[PDB]
Design a protein around this ligand. Structure first.
Ligand SMILES: NC(=O)c1cnc(N[C@H]2CCCNC2)c2cc(-c3cccc(F)c3)sc12
Length: 269
């Protein structure tokens, strides 16, 4: 990227994954900032096909609560993806450990998260890695869904398909990924949104994983909401969490019903 780096200063690393890093690029003349995701395709034999899929998915996106994708180019074995710079950073860094954030803030971010997820689901895309590290903020603190490296199509025109890949970040993963051979895509993203809401409200993830061998998950199935993180959560958002974090995905609340929830619609301070 020799001509590009002559005109653009790769000022600093914004973040990192396993595939590579995200850099802040600032044009020396215009001072325009863009984020550059740099991926070494030699990290895995299937990395060229996976990055092709991420770019393909990125090209389909156009929504106020999704990070804008500008383009990409390959230079040898390195892939460069150019994205809208989200100067508010990760939602993760608005979460005070063991505290969370004010309830009106968490509600506003949750509404924006639902708008982004409704959009993705409406075009038949599932994110599969919703977590505060993958939710960015722009200069006005509007939430933007980011990192589509695990995203896939679950509906072709008006025909759904089930998914079977165990992927995502384990404390955010729905229990059906650990119990069913195949499962519907939408309830999985609904579940991870519920874990994000829990983290925003109490600054703590509730369990290592929603599995049989996890005591913290058994505690939640047993309605022990007098234990952390639940005891830090007001009854109104907790009632919504009781509908989202439902073990059976067919009984789990859908996004149209989340939009009808009392706390979701609650006028806060
Ligand atoms: N498109 C982007 O702008 C972008 C993309 N990826 C990022 N990081 C990854 C790391 C792995 C997990 N997913 C997010 C970040 C971090 C950013 C940031 C951080 C601190 C302050 C600040 F103002 C901005 S911006 C940005």
């Amino acid at each position: 990227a020799v001509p590009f780096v002559e005109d653009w200063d790769l000022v600093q690393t914004l973040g990192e994954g396993a595939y590579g890093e995200v850099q802040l690029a600032v044009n020396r003349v215009t001072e325009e900032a863009v984020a550059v995701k740099i991926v070494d395709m030699k990290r895995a034999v299937d990395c060229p096909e996976n990055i092709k899929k991420e770019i393909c998915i990125n090209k389909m996106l156009n929504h106020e609560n999704v990070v804008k994708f500008y383009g990409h180019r390959r230079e040898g074995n390195i892939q460069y993806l150019f994205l809208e710079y989200c100067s508010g950073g990760e939602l993760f860094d608005r979460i005070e450990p063991d505290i969370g954030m004010p309830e009106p803030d968490a509600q506003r971010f949750f509404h924006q998260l639902m708008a982004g997820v409704v959009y993705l689901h409406g075009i038949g895309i599932t994110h599969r890695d919703i977590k505060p590290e993958n939710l960015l903020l722009d200069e006005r603190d509007n939430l933007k869904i980011s990192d589509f490296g695990l995203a896939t199509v679950f509906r072709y025109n008006n025909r759904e398909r089930l998914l079977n890949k165990m992927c995502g970040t384990l404390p955010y993963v729905a229990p059906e990924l650990l119990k069913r051979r195949e499962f519907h895509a939408e309830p999985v993203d609904v579940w991870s949104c519920g874990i994000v809401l829990t983290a925003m409200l109490a600054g703590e993830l509730p369990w290592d994983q929603p599995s049989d061998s996890c005591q913290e998950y058994s505690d939640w199935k047993e309605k022990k909401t007098y234990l952390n993180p639940w005891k830090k959560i007001d009854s109104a958002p907790l009632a919504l969490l009781h509908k989202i974090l439902v073990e059976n995905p067919s009984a789990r609340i859908t996004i149209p019903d989340i939009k009808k929830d009392r706390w979701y619609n609650k006028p806060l301070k």
